Each structure stands twice: as C-alpha cells, then as structure tokens.
Amino acid sequence: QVQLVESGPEMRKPGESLKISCKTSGYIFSDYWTAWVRQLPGKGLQWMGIIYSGDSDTRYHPSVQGHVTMSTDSSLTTAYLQWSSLKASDTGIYYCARLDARVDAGWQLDSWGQGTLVTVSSASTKGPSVFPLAPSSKSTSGGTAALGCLVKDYFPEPVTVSWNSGALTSGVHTFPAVLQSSGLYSLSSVVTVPSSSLGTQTYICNVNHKPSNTKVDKRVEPK
Amino acid sequence: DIQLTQSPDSLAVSLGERATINCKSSQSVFSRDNNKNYLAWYQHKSGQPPKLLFFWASSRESGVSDRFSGSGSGTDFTLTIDNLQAEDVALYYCQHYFNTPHNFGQGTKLEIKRTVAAPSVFIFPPSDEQLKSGTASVVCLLNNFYPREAKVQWKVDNALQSGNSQESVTEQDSKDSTYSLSSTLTLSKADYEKHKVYACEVTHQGLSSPVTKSFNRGE
C-alpha cells in the first residue's frame, strides 16, 4: 500500500518558521525522490522541487529557491518542506508526491499526499461554533429529508466535516466556506436522506478544526 | 525553462461525448535517444489529490480507463476522453519532466453538461442552540440542480432583504453532475424576533416560476 501522508493544516504569523512533513510508507524511500507541489487558488500547480534522501540532492524551482528548504529523514522515511520566515502570501495548499529514481524510469508523479493547507496570517485563531440544521417538515418533501450542521465563526481554514464517522458520504454537500464581515469563516454541511428512516437512523456530523485543535460531534435530530 | 500551454482553458462537454485537451510545449520534450516524450497528464478532482493518467505522453497508467488516451510528440500533445462520464469532472493538467523545473500546464477545467434539473428547496429556522448565543441564521438549501445559474432572494414579512445574507455553491457533483447552493440569512436574535414570516424565493431555468419556501417564526 503506497502512501504519502502529510502533516495537518498549520497556522503561523508572518516572519515565523514552519516545517511540514511528508511521511512515506509502502515503498523503498531510497528508490524515489520526493517532490513538493503547490496548488494555486482557482487553478494551477507549481512544481516546487525534489529531494533525494540517499544524498540530500535537491532541485528547487528557481522561483522558490532561497525561500524554502527541503530535507529528509531516511530513518523515518519522511521528507520535509521548510520556511525560515513565512510571508502572508505563502498561504496555500502544499502537496508532496513521489518520483522514480531508478534508471530508465520516467519522472512523472505517480503517487501523492492528501495536501496540507498552510495559512500565514496576523489574524487570531478561532474555533467554530457548530449548530444543528434539524430535519423538519420545512426541510422534508418528496420522500427526502435534508439535515445538516452549521459551522460558524472560525479561523483559519480548513474545517472538515464528516458524517457518521465517514460512513455517510452519498448525498453529503459540505459547502465552500464564506468569508463573513467579521473576517471569520462560516460553512454548512448538509445531507439528504430518506424521510422514512429518520426514526431508525442516527446522523452525527463530525467537525474538525485542527488549527484550533477542536473536534465536535453534533447529533442532528428531528423536531 | 520549458513551459506548457493548454487549450482550451475551460470546457463544457455533454455526457457520452468526447472531450479533447491540447498541450503545447515551448521546447520539444522528445528524446531520440529514448524515443520517448518526457510528458505526463494528470486529473485533479475536487477534494482529491491529483491523479496520474499518462506518462511518456502516451503510456496509460495502470487502472486508468480505456476511455482516456494520450497522444502527440515533441511540442504537441493531446489528451482525449471518449464517452464522457459523470466522474470525469475535474481539472486536467499536463506536465513535462524533460528538465528542471518540471512545469505543469496552466490547467483545463472540464465541466459536464447534463439535462436540466430544477433545485429541490429546503429551509431551516435557526436552532435553539444558536438563538441562545444571541444570533439567528436562517439557512435556505437549493439541492441538486443544473445548470449552475440559480438565484435566491430573501423576504421577511414580504419585505425584500438586502445585505444580510451570504451564499455558496458546491463544485459539480461527480455522480449526478449537479450543483447545490446554500443561502444563509444572518440576523441578531433581537432582529430575528421583530418578524414573523421568513421566506426564501428561488429562481432557476428548470422552474417555470419562482419557488418560495417559508416558515413562521416559532413554529
């Protein structure tokens, strides 16, 4: 099972240091490079560079050269992306990926991490309030009931929402966050289910806001 | 420094038809030593890491559908997707790895065109939990519609509201190719209690008339 797993979302003030990690498993670390790729807002990917653990050989994109550092721990089969002093414009999603280092192999990126959202900001971290969106006659019709969770007033992104510990995914819409006048974020996650089984099924939204180290499990019940 | 340019930037294709994305390199990435083109194609779905489709320009990645094909040579490459399926909705990228830096093309957004579907409308009064904290958010949900253009207007005691609501639209769904939209009216608890009837009015081309969903406060 090839896997690259990156550290969770992080939040720092400008000028501060940050090191994020890419834990690899299920393959020989020394048989591959590790690449870092930045996801641009809206559209686009930036290849930031690659590092080989066998000899610390690094190739940086010229536009990130000198601003970021790569390192590896072969003992932990982990690669690292380093900033010695972050800028607010360093905010974004960063991916790691593996690249074949064996002879005659291509250097396509065949396996990827899940991505991690680095936020650099002078704004205060704030955990969300979670409120139920209960199914009622006003959110029930045609055999379908809609229910959800309102996740309000948090900073920074991301909030993640699962339902029934990931067991409920079909019909789930977790809406893109909106920026409120306060400078805080807000979103809602909804799901549609049969109205016929509101008496037999239970629905719980699992809200995670790692930057505030906050986890909420809200049971959403009809009334 | 080798750069890639994709065309078109955006693409809307009907289910079951063929989608075509072009990728052009500023320098050839063909090696005669190899007889290989140092190019790859990626698929980036919402909420997923990018996924490798093709390498050496035309070698299909194990597990990638036969509907996908990569072709081209030197500076000129093409990704083709036949018999378009709902799950093909994504951004698509080409990448070269001929020399460093291994640059990506700017990306092509593929939208799926499906039949017209009217939104299903649901409304949620503020929870007792939220009201206890002093604020009231009324949520109006427009579910599973196509195409994307949908409008929501809030009326409170039949008065048109302005400047007290926020809305957000989902990405296109990978299973049924629809969109969903949430509109949230946010008021203070004191303001929320000045009024009786809260109404969300929805317009969409799959509807022949504006659909209204409303409730009386405290019911």
Binding site: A101, V103 | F98
Partner: peptide, 9 residues
C-alpha cells in the same frame, strides 16, 4: 536536446 537525468538508483 537532452533531458536532465534524475536517476539515482
């Protein structure tokens, strides 16, 4: 004309 070889084995 020629690629940058990244092979390390």
């Amino acid at each position: 004309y020629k690629p940058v070889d990244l092979s390390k084995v």
